[PDB]
Amino acid sequence: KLVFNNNPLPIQAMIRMFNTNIDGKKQIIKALTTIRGIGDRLSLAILRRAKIPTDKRAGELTEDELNEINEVILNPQKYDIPEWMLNHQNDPIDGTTKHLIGNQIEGTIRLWNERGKKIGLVRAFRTSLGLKVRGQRTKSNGRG
Amino acid sequence: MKYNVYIEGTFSGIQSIMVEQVYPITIKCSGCNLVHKKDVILSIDSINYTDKDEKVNLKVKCASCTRQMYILIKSMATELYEEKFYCAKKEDNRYLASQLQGRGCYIEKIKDANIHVLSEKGRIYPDIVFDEGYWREEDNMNNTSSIEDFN
Amino acid sequence: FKEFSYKGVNLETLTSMSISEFKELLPSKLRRSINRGFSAAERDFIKKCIKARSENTGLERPEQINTNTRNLPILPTMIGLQIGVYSGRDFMPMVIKEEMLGRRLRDYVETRKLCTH
Amino acid sequence: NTEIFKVRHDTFIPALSEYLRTNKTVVPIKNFDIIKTSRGKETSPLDINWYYTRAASIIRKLLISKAKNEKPLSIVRFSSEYGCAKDRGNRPNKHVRASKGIIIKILNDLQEKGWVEKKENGWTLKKEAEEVSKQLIEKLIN
Amino acid sequence: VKRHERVEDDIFNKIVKDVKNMRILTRTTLSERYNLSLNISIKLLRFLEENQIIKLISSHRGSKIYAGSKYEPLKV
Amino acid sequence: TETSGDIKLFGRYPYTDLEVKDITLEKYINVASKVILPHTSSRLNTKKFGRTKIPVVERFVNAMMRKGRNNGKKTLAMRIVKDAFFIIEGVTGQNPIQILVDAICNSGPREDSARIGKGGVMKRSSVDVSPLRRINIAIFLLAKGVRNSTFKDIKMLPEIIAEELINAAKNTQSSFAVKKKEEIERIAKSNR
Amino acid sequence: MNKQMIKYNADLETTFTVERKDFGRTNRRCRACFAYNGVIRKYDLMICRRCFREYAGDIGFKIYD
RNA sequence: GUAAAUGUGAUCGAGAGGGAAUGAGCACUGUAAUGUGCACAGGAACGAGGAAUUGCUAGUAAUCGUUAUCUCAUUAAGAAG
Ligand SMILES: [Zn+2]
């Protein structure tokens, strides 16, 4: 009898990367947009340096494929992803550039805003009260 | 026509039921017997007037026969809790929230009412949501408040 | 505990650098202001700061320096000084602490009182 | 004769693309696998060989320009040819050019292979680049 | 229940038996009768049109239409 | 390319031996005018019965340029109906054109409700529709049924066109257009 | 007038001169009435919309359509 | 900065629609950024709108871009074509 020979592999329901859960049925691109700090654009960048076919689903990936992606997230600058692609450029505290993942984002924004408030930076005071800081008009819109 | 709005059910651990006097209602014209194409919001705070300067809470023209339709809410509340909440009047095993007075229309359905609960322990549960006609809450002292068979 | 640092540089080194060198650290819009050269007003303000840091000795505070140079970025030469910045109505006083580097003097003063209805 | 018009574009652009890659006549820009073609585009291309489809379509623009005896093609002309409508949030969509860097690299690659000659007011074909196209078409229609 | 990302052996077997005697069939039928997603209704349908079990009758833009063993066209 | 013969619709369909099959409708349905593509710019709308001389499938594509966002997109409508005719010709086995004709015949309500009272209150009554209004409503209902059916459903729009038109031609309860024709006629009778 | 300003470089010792660009309302006053608002700048007129309509027929403008 | 809707092929698959508040940056206009562009993030309401209410009869209404038109150093989500 004939056989299909074009079927996906036996698939797992969901998997863990980053203290984050990824739906195994979801195709790798929109699936890596679950981890904070991996947007659409950067998700495609990582996958083509780890060299994984974009059309596989997240639950088909081996441990090996998940290590390849895990390695590229901890150190993008090693696999020729240039610094203008990354979250945190010319860090005031370190001089360096780095890519913040998961809960690091909120923690870094907090420690930053808190420092400005300790010394009375007007920009930080407004964000704490729920006000706007990019010059937007606050009379007509943005109520409640 | 006059309609009483009751809150019916089995009440446990409840001191008072409070009701927002805001009713999404289906109305039928008493002239041409046609149902209004959309539900209308009937609110106690809506101020309208008949063509004889009588206060009403809703004034709607029938789209088919052009007849005017009017509804007045009479709150049956015995008191205002925190000057905001209409305490429904307890009547045996139910609560009388309001009386709706229709002229030129029938009220066919009240869809929903926003309900708040005051427990026997003096705790307020605002904007309670029923699941399949049931609501239940427990406090930090293990006192239960519940409503079962809500209608 | 570690020394104060701005974009990699220690306060000891930072207080010794020329304005031309400090320019390699600052944000883009602040750099463009220093590349386009100082006004005659700004030069007097800066020369007074350099004089003051030099002149002051012991435990007595130097006198306040007032300015309407609102857009000037804060420089490592006015650290520890008391400076009055014009608010459109009055010279609002402040002390220039280390953590203010990389910002303009207008960022620390309100020209409009906060609103509470 | 104007030999190019005798075959369909969606058969010619794919056909030449293979002849390019099997001889490596054009070399990819650094980071071609993650760069976008314009600031108007949403994501990078779906085909890894997009750089070669650009090279194949650039020589087509030049063949038809030569066929109609137009003035030579400039870097600005090509940038408006490949342009698109950019998405701007809460605002109308707006026409924007292609990025020049890709096009410059392709034209400098083709110069080194002797396929494209720089004139004072634009770029132009050369005998070898014409004859490759001629000899392809003569098989492809048959 | 949600849709599926495999055509397992016993679904595959019965689809062959079901595709004969059907007339025009399309991406939706495989995905609304059985539980397959659109991304696996395309792949199975394309496979059967290589195996000569079905035949393609239109493919204009992405709109794509097929026929099974009891199709019969008009005649002049 | 495909043919060097006589004019056929989409270059495929016979364009002859067509019967209306309701004498009340005869004069108002143009199946005469041989056109290769359901498109004309003929400026008949500025006339007294000129909108009854426009060809049938033309009137039928115009009905698709709706829901606001699709205004003016007449090419898109032609693309859609072309495919539907392939589905229908296959399914039915007969000239898609006779399916379309019979869909119209069944789907127009014959009696309707209206206000008659002039010198007093306006009281509703039954009234009898003209030939022209009867066909105008048929197209309207067939269109409205299709549009709303496809909105948030996975099925392809050209397929929904084939579902409705077959059923309508066959006068089955299955058609949205046919059901609503029954409703209007029942209410008309209630007010008789 | 094209006014000039001195500016100091980062050394606060070397000086250079830069020119102020003429822009905004300050030099585009209505040639009939000195107004700063509603000035028509086209065809090298410099006349406000109020003044234009009384003089238009003397200049030679007409409403044809 | 010399159309866009649009035409063909791929792709994605029912909050992969949507881009609001915000971070460390990288440039431009300018006497001065507080204004504008760019890259990387981040990812709010909103799932078709109560009582009411406004135009429109044919190349009209609605859709789609564009202004060597007006404002204009830099700024259009405005008018007038
Ligand atoms: Zn004037």
Task: Report how far residue C62's alpha carbon sits from residue C55's, in angstroms, rounded to the nearest whole number.
Answer: 8
Task: Report how far residue B58's alpha carbon sits from residue B54's, in angstroms, rounded to the nearest whole number.
Answer: 11
Alpha helices in chain F (DSSP H): 56-62, 74-92, 96-107, 131-149, 157-169, 176-190
Nearest-CA neighbor of E67 among F93, F13, F87, A4? F87
Decide if C4 contacts C11 (C-beta within 8 A).
yes
Task: Report how far residue G42's alpha carbon sits from residue G39's, in angstroms, rounded to the nearest whole number.
Answer: 9
Is residue G28 helix, strand or coil?
A: coil
Helices D127-140 and D9-21 sit at what angle, rounded to 10 degrees?
120
B26: which 2 tokens? 């289906």
Tell me which DSSP letter residue B88 carries.
Answer: P
Which whole-number Å values give the CA distances from F158 to F84, F91, F105, in the listed order? Answer: 5, 13, 22
Alpha helices in chain D (DSSP H): 9-21, 50-67, 75-81, 100-112, 127-140
Nucleotide nearest to B58 (CA to C1'): H51
Decide if C26 contacts C34 (C-beta within 8 A).
yes
Residue A142 backbone zone (phi > 0: left; psi -120 to 50: alpha; other: beta):
left
Residue type, C109: V
Task: Report how far residue A20's alpha carbon sits from residue A34's, in angstroms, rounded to the nearest whole number.
Answer: 7
User: Please, what is the Cα angle at G52 between G48 and G55, to 5 degrees?
Assistant: 140
Tell me which DSSP letter residue F69 carries.
Answer: T
Residue type, F16: T
A with C: touching (≥3 Cβ pairs within 8 Å): yes
Resolution reached, in Å?
10.8
Task: Report how far residue E68's alpha carbon sits from residue E26's, in angstroms, rounded to the nearest whole number.
Answer: 11
Task: Report how far residue D126's alpha carbon sits from residue B102's, in angstroms, rounded to the nearest whole number.
Answer: 90
Residue type, A27: Q
| Length of chain B counted residue by residue | 151
Name the residue closest to the C1' of H62 by its CA: F71
Contact of F55 with chain E, judged by CB distance below 8 Å, is answered with no
Nearest-CA neighbor of F77 among F96, F88, F63? F63
User: Pseudo-torsion of CA F99, F100, F102, F104, nearest 10°?
Assistant: 160
Decide if C93 contacts C109 (C-beta within 8 A).
no
Query: Does B60 contact strand H, using a CB cutoff of 7 Å?
Result: yes
User: Please, what is the Cα angle at A87 between A85 and A88, to 5 degrees?
Assistant: 115
User: Pseudo-torsion of CA E25, E27, E28, E31, nearest 10°?
Assistant: 110
Backbone angles phi, psi at D133, to 5 degrees: -60, -45
Which chain G residue lies closest to C22 (C-alpha atoms)?
G10
Please, what's the b/e burial string for B125-141 (b: 16 or more CB within 10 A of its CB; e: otherwise)? beebeeeeeebeeeeee
Task: Report how far residue D35's alpha carbon sits from residue F89's, in angstroms, rounded to the nearest whole number.
Answer: 48
Strand partners, B24: B41
Task: Report how far residue F64's alpha carbon sits from residue F81's, in angstroms, rounded to the nearest whole number.
Answer: 9
Q: Tell me whether strands C91-95 and D116-119 are parallel, antiparallel or unpaired.
A: unpaired
How close F122 gets to chain E, by Cα (Å)?
A: 51
Contact of A26 with chain E, judged by CB distance below 8 Å, is answered with no
Which chain A residue lies closest to D48 (C-alpha atoms)?
A48
Indicate which technique resolved this structure: cryo-EM
Q: Please, which residues have CB within 8 angstroms of residue G47's CB and are 6 or more apart in sequence?
A: G30, G31, G32, G39, G40, G55
Task: Report how far residue A53's alpha carbon sits from residue A56's, in angstroms, rounded to the nearest whole number.
Answer: 6
CA of residue G40 to C1' of nucleotide H69, angstroms: 12
Decide if C96 contacts C74 (C-beta within 8 A).
yes
Within residues 41-100 of protein chain A, the ones with CB less than 7 A from nucleic strand H are 41-42, 55, 84-92, 100
B with G: touching (≥3 Cβ pairs within 8 Å): no
Nearest-CA neighbor of F79 among F181, F167, F171, F161? F161
Number of alpha carbons in the 13 Å side-chain half-sphere of residue B63? 7
Q: Which residue, among C3, C5, C26, C105, would best test binding to A if mutated, counting the most A CBs under 10 Å from its CB?
A: C5
